[PDB]
């Protein structure tokens, strides 16, 4: 199976994930080069479905010029059946690659960490605030960690969770709404397990969040400014909070 995206020919290496209508193939070009290609069905899409697609290929696209941790878009193809969309391949997701890892190396935590807030950055200074973040929307690419998506549209699964879940986003039923969820996706990669992975009943867990009486584990590791990041990612008042900035000027990121 092949295909053409603006008269341009894709050989099929791969699926690497499909995720609702849309799919991912690992293809190649005539040079013989690799790109991640994310078809998507517009045959059954409703007109508010359709926009969200709009709205992510659009900031995807603006986005290119300013940070280098969002996966590139090098060209796409938008008709009234489908959309076709040419990106750069990565090597593997974040949440896959944690998941296999197990215990992680300090300074490969630091690099990540450092992609991780530049991307997320990025995405605030356009007034997008991508509300649940979790390690699955990052991408190991050339040894560097890249955003895949925004939020804005449907995610995918390679061929979901609550533990990343700002206190304010359940309280309500901000920017540093997203400091808390990469605070967690740090936590875990220090300690192993999200701050409330310990509370089985769903019901329980969102509980636990929003209660200020109920205290989040924070043992002793030899890296001082790394526990100190956690202390400030995971402070349950969003006033209160440390911001992307204010962590870019953090010892954890600036020294070594
Ligand atoms: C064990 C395992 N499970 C899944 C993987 C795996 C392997 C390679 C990749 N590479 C990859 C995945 C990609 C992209 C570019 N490269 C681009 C995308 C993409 C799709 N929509 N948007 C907005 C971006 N993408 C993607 O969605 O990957 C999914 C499967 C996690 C991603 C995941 N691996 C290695």
Avoid at 45 to 59: C, G, P
Avoid at 144 to 173: C, H, R, S, W
């Amino acid at each position: 199976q092949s295909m053409s995206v603006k008269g341009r020919i894709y050989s099929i290496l791969k699926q690497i994930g499909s995720g609702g209508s849309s799919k991912v193939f690992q293809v190649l070009n005539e040079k013989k080069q690799i790109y991640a290609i994310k078809y998507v069905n517009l045959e059954e899409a409703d007109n508010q479905t359709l926009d969200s697609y709009r709205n992510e290929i659009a900031y995807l696209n603006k986005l290119q010029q300013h940070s280098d941790k969002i996966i590139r878009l090098y060209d796409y193809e938008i008709t009234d059946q489908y959309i076709y969309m040419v990106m750069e391949c990565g090597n593997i997701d974040l949440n896959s690659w944690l998941k296999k890892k197990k215990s992680i190396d300090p300074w490969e935590r630091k690099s990540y960490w450092k992609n991780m807030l530049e991307a997320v950055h990025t995405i605030h200074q356009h007034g997008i605030v991508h509300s649940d973040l979790k390690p699955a929307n990052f991408l190991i690419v050339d040894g560097m960690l890249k955003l895949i998506d925004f939020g804005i549209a449907n995610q995918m699964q390679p061929d979901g969770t609550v533990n990343y879940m700002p206190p304010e986003a359940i309280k309500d039923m901000s920017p540093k709404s997203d400091v808390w969820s990469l605070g967690c996706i740090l936590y875990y990669m220090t300690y192993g397990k999200t701050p409330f992975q310990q509370i089985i009943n769903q019901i329980s867990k969102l509980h636990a969040i929003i209660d200020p009486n109920h205290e989040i584990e924070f043992p002793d590791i030899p890296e001082k400014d790394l526990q100190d990041v956690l202390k400030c990612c995971l402070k349950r008042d969003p006033k209160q909070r440390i911001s992307i900035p204010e962590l870019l000027a953090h010892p954890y990121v600036q020294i070594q």
